[PDB]
Design a protein around this ligand. Sequence first.
Ligand SMILES: NC(=O)c1ccc2c(c1)CCCN2Cc1ccc(C(=O)NO)cc1
Ligand SMILES: [K+]
Ligand SMILES: [K+]
Ligand SMILES: [Zn+2]
Length: 354
Amino acid sequence: PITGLVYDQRMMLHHNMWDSHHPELPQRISRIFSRHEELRLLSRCHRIPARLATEEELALCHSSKHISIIKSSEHMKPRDLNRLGDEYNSIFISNESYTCALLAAGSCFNSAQAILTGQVRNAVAIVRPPGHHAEKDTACGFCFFNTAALTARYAQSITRESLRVLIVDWDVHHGNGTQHIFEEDDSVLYISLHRYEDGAFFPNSEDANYDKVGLGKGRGYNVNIPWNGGKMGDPEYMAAFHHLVMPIAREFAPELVLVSAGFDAARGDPLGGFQVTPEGYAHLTHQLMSLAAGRVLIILEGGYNLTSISESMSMCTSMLLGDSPPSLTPLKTSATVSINNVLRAHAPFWSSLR
Ligand SMILES: NC(=O)c1ccc2c(c1)CCCN2Cc1ccc(C(=O)NO)cc1
Ligand SMILES: [K+]
Ligand SMILES: [K+]
Ligand SMILES: [Zn+2]
């Protein structure tokens, strides 16, 4: 009946040497860590050490070439770092980026191991750079390796291939990498909520639409909940969890839950433009804790308002520790439309939606 926490100051070393104000800042993780101390959560948790992912672990999800290319950046001069980052959509690289990405993934492997070996019930990973946009063969959107996807495969590698893992991605962006990595898998249920705007919102692909339900034996195991029409908040997210995320997750019956927990849908985020409150994130966390005998690992993805992410992730940890949920309106029309589109898309696969 213990909550694990992983954080390591070394993940701050990845930085943007050309634009020190780029929103994916080092102090995202230190601010969140500090807020956990201030709220007296850190002393309630079991500290899990960070470690480097190995290259063989990276190969659970990534090509040898991709791994090789990111590793080669450790030794590059500034202009070669610039050139290499520019071969991707929305990436900056410093000499420390590869190590930090390794630490983010390995931290999460150690957390999943702690859960699956019974050392802890649940856990939180305060890590950067983020992961969910990283593809098999490429970096994207501040992400080098797909930490959550790798964690699902690492879990399978210490249990069985068919271990049922649910990944709930509540970052405001679509986890294109995660979707693609698991598109043909029925062992990993990917559920993403994300701002879409008919492709106007990053990463700007119709892959994120509600009709992408999975492929082959993975058909039904990819659930996209795309928002259109501007700001969404607690009412919409609670409704999506009520009608879609929780009924599907219960029917799937996961043995492990990973949260791609970006906090860029939060009130105050300059990129997300949404209004999810710390109390809202606490309720989402508490609902997920009813799955998988409580085996939930919360992995930081995006989120760029330092105060908002610190308060929101801390509230999630409070819920993992067993604190009672804090106290928390009709949905915007477009949100009803989105939810109904996903329900229609997934009723063929999930009896609970019928
Ligand atoms: N303010 C900025 O420097 C900045 C950087 C990147 C960016 C924007 C602003 C707004 C348009 C889209 N992008 C790319 C981007 C933005 C967010 C993320 C992210 O949070 N993914 O989960 C990944 C990539
Ligand atoms: K998402
Ligand atoms: K899948
Ligand atoms: Zn994001």
